Amino acid sequence: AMTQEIEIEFKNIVTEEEFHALCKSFSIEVFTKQVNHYFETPNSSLKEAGSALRIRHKGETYTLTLKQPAEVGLLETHQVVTENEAKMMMETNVIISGAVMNQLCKLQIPVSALTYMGSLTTERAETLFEGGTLVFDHSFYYNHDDYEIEFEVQDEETGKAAFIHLLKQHNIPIRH
Amino acid sequence: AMTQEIEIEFKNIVTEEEFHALCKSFSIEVFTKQVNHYFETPNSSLKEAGSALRIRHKGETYTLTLKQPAEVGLLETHQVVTENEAKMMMETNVIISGAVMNQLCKLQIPVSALTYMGSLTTERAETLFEGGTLVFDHSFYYNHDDYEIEFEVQDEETGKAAFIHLLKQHNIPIRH
Ligand SMILES: Nc1ncnc2c1ncn2[C@@H]1O[C@H](COP(=O)(O)O)[C@@H](O)[C@H]1O
Ligand SMILES: Nc1ncnc2c1ncn2[C@@H]1O[C@H](COP(=O)(O)O)[C@@H](O)[C@H]1O
Numbered sequence: 001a002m003t004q005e006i007e008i009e010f011k012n013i014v015t016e017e018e019f020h021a022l023c024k025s026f027s028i029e030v031f032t033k034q035v036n037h038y039f040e041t042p043n044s045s046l047k048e049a050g051s052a053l054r055i056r057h058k059g060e061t062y063t064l065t066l067k068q069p070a071e072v073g074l075l076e077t078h079q080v081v082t083e084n085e086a087k088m089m090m091e092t093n094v095i096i097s098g099a100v101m102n103q104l105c106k107l108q109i110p111v112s113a114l115t116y117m118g119s120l121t122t123e124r125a126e127t128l129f130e131g132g133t134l135v136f137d138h139s140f141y142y143n144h145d146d147y148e149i150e151f152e153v154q155d156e157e158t159g160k161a162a163f164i165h166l167l168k169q170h171n172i173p174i175r176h
Numbered sequence: 177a178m179t180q181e182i183e184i185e186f187k188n189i190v191t192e193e194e195f196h197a198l199c200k201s202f203s204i205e206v207f208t209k210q211v212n213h214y215f216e217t218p219n220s221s222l223k224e225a226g227s228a229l230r231i232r233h234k235g236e237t238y239t240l241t242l243k244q245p246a247e248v249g250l251l252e253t254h255q256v257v258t259e260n261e262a263k264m265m266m267e268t269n270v271i272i273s274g275a276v277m278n279q280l281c282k283l284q285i286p287v288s289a290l291t292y293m294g295s296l297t298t299e300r301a302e303t304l305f306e307g308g309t310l311v312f313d314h315s316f317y318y319n320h321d322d323y324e325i326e327f328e329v330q331d332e333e334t335g336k337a338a339f340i341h342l343l344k345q346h347n348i349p350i351r352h
Contacts, residue, residue, distance in 0.1 A: 035294070036318065038316075038318055038319075040316055040321070044321050047319075047320070047321060052319055115297075117296075117297045117316035118211075118294065118295045118296045118297055118316060118317065118318065119294045119295045120293065120294035120295075120318050121291075121293045121294055123218075140216055140220075140293040140294060141294070141317070141318070142212070142214055142294070142296045142317065143223075143228075144220075144223060145216070145220050145223065
């Protein structure tokens with residue numbers, strides 16, 4: 001129901017052609033839809049604290065997730081909520097109690113100001129690779145859609161060298 | 177219920193500092209919230225055709241809007257819809273019939289593939305300026321907040337020159 005973890009993320013923007021080629025190299029054919037419902041204050045408090053708050057709806061699950069700065073990478077706090085809980089946070093200015101609330105209070109985020117600001121859809125596939133999780137995302141934003149490759153690892157040094165070598169292996173330039 | 181118009185609108189991205197200064201400059205105090213709910217096919221058909229399809233929720237009003245290329249700026253087709261019509265489009269992905277649908281069919285969009293992809297909150301202020309309308313936008317996207325100045329004009333040539341001139345006076349670089 002609730003988990004925390006420290007995660008380090010690398011990300012690279014790729015063309016469709018690069019994306020398809022990399023998918024083919026890893027036998028990625030099926031993608032899973034997810035929708036991210038994001039929150040912020042009118043003053044952008046969370047962005048100011050290098051942090052992000054969202055409810056992810058993926059298959060049957062809603063997960064309230066906070067990402068904040070760690071000494072390196074991010075401290076993630078995840079809390080599975082009900083559909084009714086998720087709807088309530090989107091409709092009204094209440095955040096459910098529990099671990100995410102507790103972290104937001106330590107961050108000194110004016111919790112009552114948090115408002116549901118928007119949403120976006122991602123078609124996602126993951127594979128385990130080297131020190132971590134290689135993620136293939138195709139996301140649909142307001143104006144445009146992107147292809148992205150992410151790599152989530154627990155060891156920064158080796159994770160970074162591994163991601164960079166994978167990109168060079170496939171002739172994909174670094175685009176941050 | 178239904179209108180069309182050719183809209184000629186220049187846009188420039190600005191920083192938060194530039195934005196606040198420009199607002200003070202123009203005595204812009206009160207902003208109006210809107211939420212845009214955007215639609216696209218998995219193959220990005222709208223975007224490939226220079227177009228966009230969105231339901232705008234502002235105050236108590238919902239407007240289905242298609243923007244498409246014209247010889248100058250964009251041709252917009254707006255259709256006022258009820259809240260329930262709005263929600264059924266979002267939950268079922270079926271676009272209601274009428275002028276937007278008619279235009280979509282002429283563009284040759286595979287309309288049955290259109291899906292609800294996401295939403296975005298924009299805060300907007302306006303003021304009349306040199307025979308045009310100056311628009312101040314602050315939008316809250318998935319992990320950033322974006323500031324824009326826009327200028328809606330009647331004539332492309334002179335509107336351009338007056339927008340570029342405004343930007344120059346406030347030492348705002350051109351950023352499209
Ligand atoms: N602002 C909102 N208010 C109420 N319900 C919503 C809102 N956004 C999404 N939903 C609903 O909550 C569920 C999650 O939406 P989604 O993640 O967009 O599929 C769906 O059944 C939607 O119909
Ligand atoms: N994905 C969705 N599915 C069903 N209903 C929604 C969805 N998104 C928004 N709504 C509803 O439509 C109305 C407009 O939402 P908003 O424009 O997000 O304020 C609200 O009363 C919501 O409960």
